[PDB]
Symmetry: C2
Subunit: 331 residues, 2 copies
Amino acid sequence: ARPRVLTGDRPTGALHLGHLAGSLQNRVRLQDEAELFVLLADVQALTDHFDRPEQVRENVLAVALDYLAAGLDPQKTTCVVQSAVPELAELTVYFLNLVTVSHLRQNPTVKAEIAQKGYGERVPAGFFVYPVSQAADIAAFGATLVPVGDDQLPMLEQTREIVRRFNALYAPVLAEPQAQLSRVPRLPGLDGQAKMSKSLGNAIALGDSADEVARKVMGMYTDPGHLRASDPGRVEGNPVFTFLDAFDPDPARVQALKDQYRAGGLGDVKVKKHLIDVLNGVLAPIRTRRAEYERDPDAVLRFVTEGTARGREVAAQTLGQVRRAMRLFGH
Amino acid sequence: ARPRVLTGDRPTGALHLGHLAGSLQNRVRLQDEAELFVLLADVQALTDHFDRPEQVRENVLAVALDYLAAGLDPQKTTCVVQSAVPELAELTVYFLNLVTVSHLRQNPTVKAEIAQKGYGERVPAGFFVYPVSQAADIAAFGATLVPVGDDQLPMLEQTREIVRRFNALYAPVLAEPQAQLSRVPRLPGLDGQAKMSKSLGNAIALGDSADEVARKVMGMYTDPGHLRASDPGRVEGNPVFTFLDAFDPDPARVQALKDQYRAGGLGDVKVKKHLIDVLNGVLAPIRTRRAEYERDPDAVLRFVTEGTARGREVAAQTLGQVRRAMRLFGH
Ligand SMILES: N[C@@H](Cc1c[nH]c2ccccc12)C(=O)O
């Protein structure tokens, strides 16, 4: 617990295996060697789900359950609800003056999201400026370390430019955050697509039963040109093997399987059955905790209402120095 | 009283003659005909003076002074410092999700301000976004009536739209404000321009001495082509006549000079000399009232502090409604 680390998820659905490999495992490690803050960004979730406020509200507790199921320790990690800390909103408006529409339009990750969203020019204001509200999140909690995939770096770098702009303009009162680069490639979906997502219908939820997990793995995309076991098959592009590199505890088995698969005679069945065994080993403890916490709804609520109290107090302090530094009337 | 009315100014310096005919005397009278709220747009002032925070801080008290000297009574008007009502920033963020960047791009007023400031695509986000920040000001205070210059209509109309969209998506807890059009269009500068402002240096501040007011009138743009008295003059484009038209109580008397001046025996000096006194007359009491308060600074502070508390009270009430209407986790 030395550097304060900030991470988070906009609450829009249940977490899945992609989040586990992409951010959860690394977060369970961080809680023991840093002070970890996780933001349930329901406000940010609203920049594009403003038409589905029920969906957002219900997922705040569902993702919290997922964090805990994942292994995030209520006595180690501060879980906070963005909605319950208005200090963030207050800070993002001040931050809006430190950035240009021009530079906001150049952000490559938002540009790509809008592209995939098909918005066109009909981009909702809140979404267009969300990178700043995130900057507000980082500075307010006073995080100095932010886990990031290269897809979020422009979010992070802008944060850096903003804090830098704020300190030089008013007074050097905000910490400059540093990135904790990557998590190695993103977990592809069950049918082989680049992205794993509920929406795309190719995911395995952390909450999926051991049976379901087995079924989902069975119908996984493999190798279009591999038609029967005797045939040789390709590893690259084949998610069954991409899943194995991200969860299989022993690469010896992994590399061995890869061998015999390019050879021939090793059907998808024997490989997949082995995937099932490795996934059930990573997931079983996550399923037990999740079921346990289900019996203890009060324990999950305590997890968030308390992280929130802490988060509120921290953000409140920062705004105090921000207000004074900005020379705001009465400070 | 009856309706709630929201009016305000961006604290950037002393108020002048344009605010007077522009609204100050208007609110002086709607001050007992309704519940009048006057917002010192502290934050909105930063989307333009984010690099000169000191300038803003200093003018909150100076404009409040201006307010009081203009005739506003502490017992009937709620003076509110924007920055001290964080609830407004909270509501602004939520409103941002209700409008598109392309819609903000077609606001004629902001577009003109932007071209004048030479920002180009390098427009500060906070500024490009100020119209909705204003809609939040309106919606948070429950304002049903908003006096508006011909010029501020786009903004007023965007407010109703957003309020409307907010009510349909979430719940009908916000009121659509209605406009109060004025007669005297934007009082022009001494310059002969369309705008009077301390920035353009063509303004007669409410604090200027009988000597100054007289000196400013004498250097006031009139009519080229009219070189000597004798000659015939014309009222179109002459700030002095559009000054008499907004500050002179005897229209029969005005339309009088309008005759003679088109003929040729009314020297611009004579027009001026008259008008200068019609201004000292409208200004005389304002000057004495200012001295009183200038000698009771404690009272100006009071006006601001008490009002700001009252207004936050009001904002807090509406936000509670908004927060529950949006189904934000926990409400
Ligand atoms: N996926 C979200 C996660 C998030 C929300 N707010 C944050 C603040 C800091 C770090 C991450 C976040 C994002 O793109 O940002």
